[PDB]
Amino acid sequence: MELIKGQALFLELDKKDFLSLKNNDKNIPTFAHPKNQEKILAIFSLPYKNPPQNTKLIAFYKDKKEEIFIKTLEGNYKSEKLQVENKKIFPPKTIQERIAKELKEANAIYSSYTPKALFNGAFNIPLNSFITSDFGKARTFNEKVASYHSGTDFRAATGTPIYAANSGVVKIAKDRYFAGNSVVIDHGFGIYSQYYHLSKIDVKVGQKIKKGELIGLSGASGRVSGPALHFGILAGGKQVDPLDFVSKFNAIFQ
Ligand SMILES: [Zn+2]
């Protein structure tokens, strides 16, 4: 019941007489424990940027309240001190609008909660190469965090086939300002995977997709630093450390 910022954890709770799980009147959804039928699960995530120092949750049962305290740990993320901090960019109106529009779309998707499992066992990595840029690489103008790498980058020459980390429904399959050519998949229970900077999109919004199924070709779209696959996980409303999430998720749903 310590959690590093930008990570998810799976809380286990007794199923019997459970009524709700709350965080200051935010209801946290619950789903079945796959291997213990007397338990349920909930995903709790702390944001990378500007998280609470401590979190208290209440699980309300028919005959009892149960408090749950989680301290925010800082972790050991690569960070470096920005030296400029003009901090305010001044983009053209046409770009501000497209960003704004795409941000409203994405927030509508990531806020929605499909209350069933759309995945199929464990997550696989979307590509069998290696990490060239880690999740959580931060740029700080003290005393906090100016920007951070909200996913992890795999080495990929332009045109490398990218496969869905798990089964789900495609919710985004288009070119967006920061993500380039983007695929976003709903796996259920508020878990979304993100495949950014693609050179080709091979799926369509609404499509049901299987684990291991081709979703496009890596590229360098929307990416300044050249070709790579940006892979993200959003869970519990927040961007979380994707390889961390996958190992925790797979430890439960294998
Ligand atoms: Zn990235």
Residue numbers in the entry: 20 to 273
What does the paper say about this structure?
We have described herein the reactions and the structure of Pgp3, a Csd protein of C. jejuni. This enzyme turns over the cell-wall peptidoglycan by both the d,d-endopeptidase and d,d-carboxypeptidase activities, as documented by mass spectrometric characterization of the requisite reactions with synthetic cell-wall fragments. The Pgp3 monomer is structurally divided into four regions: the N-terminal domain (NTD, residues 21–95), a flexible linker (residues 96–147), the LytM domain (residues 148–259), and the C-terminal helix (residues 260–273). The Pgp3 LytM domain contains a highly conserved tetrahedral Zn2+-ion-binding motif (H168xxxD172 and HxH249).
By using the H247A mutant variant, we successfully solved two structures of Pgp3 in complex with a pentapeptide (1, Ac-l-Ala1-γ-d-Glu2-mDAP3-d-Ala4−d-Ala5) and with a crosslinked muramyl tetra-tri peptide (2, NAM-l-Ala1-γ-d-Glu2-mDAP3-d-Ala4−mDAP3-γ-d-Glu2-l-Ala1-NAM). In the presence of the pentapeptide, excellent electron-density map was obtained for the mDAP3-d-Ala4-d-Ala5 segment. The importance of these two complexes is that the scissile bond in the peptide substrate was seen bound within the active site. The critical portions of both peptides with Pgp3 are shared motifs between the two structures. Both peptides contain the common motif, mDAP3-d-Ala4, and only the third amino acid is different, i.e., mDAP3 vs Ala5. In the pentapeptide-bound complex, Arg158 might form salt-bridge interactions with d-Ala5. Substrate carbonyl oxygen displaces Wat-2, thereby interacting directly with Zn2+ and polarizing the d-Ala4 carbonyl bond. This renders the amide bond susceptible to nucleophilic attack by Wat-1.
